[PDB]
Amino acid sequence: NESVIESCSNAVQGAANDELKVHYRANEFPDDPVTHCFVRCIGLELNLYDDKYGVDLQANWENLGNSDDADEEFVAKHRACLEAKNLETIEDLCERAYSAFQCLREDYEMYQNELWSHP
Ligand SMILES: O=Cc1ccccc1
Ligand SMILES: [N+]
Ligand SMILES: [N+]
Ligand SMILES: [N+]
Ligand SMILES: [N+]
Ligand SMILES: [N+]
Ligand SMILES: [N+]
Ligand SMILES: [N+]
Ligand SMILES: [N+]
Ligand SMILES: [N+]
Structure with missing residues (x-):
């Protein structure tokens, strides 16, 4: 939503940038x-x-237009993708988050046309 986008653009140094906000x-x-x-x-x-x-x-399952329990294969595939990113070894918190996001990027693209992965 706009609110979180606007706030995050202010919270992040350099993110209050027209060309980036366009993306x-x-x-x-x-x-x-x-x-x-x-x-x-x-x-x-x-x-x-x-x-x-x-x-x-x-939470991501639900953010992808679902209201039910996540499909088992959605959970398994993403848990595996995320484990393969070795997130705990990425020291920079932003890089770690972005790397984790890369596992979900396609789901969000297909959609656009708690199940913590590290409990
Ligand atoms: O901030 C990282 C992240 C990871 C998965 C989904 C959304 C955001
Ligand atoms: N902004
Ligand atoms: N949070
Ligand atoms: N959540
Ligand atoms: N539900
Ligand atoms: N549910
Ligand atoms: N359930
Ligand atoms: N399932
Ligand atoms: N990981
Ligand atoms: N951040």
């Missing part, structure tokens, strides 16, 4: 340090992500 409202998130932190900010604010507990897969 963000268009659901594109370039692989750059400002966007990394912006993506982290949105994940934290929407309760989709946590620096320690990783991705909440049920």
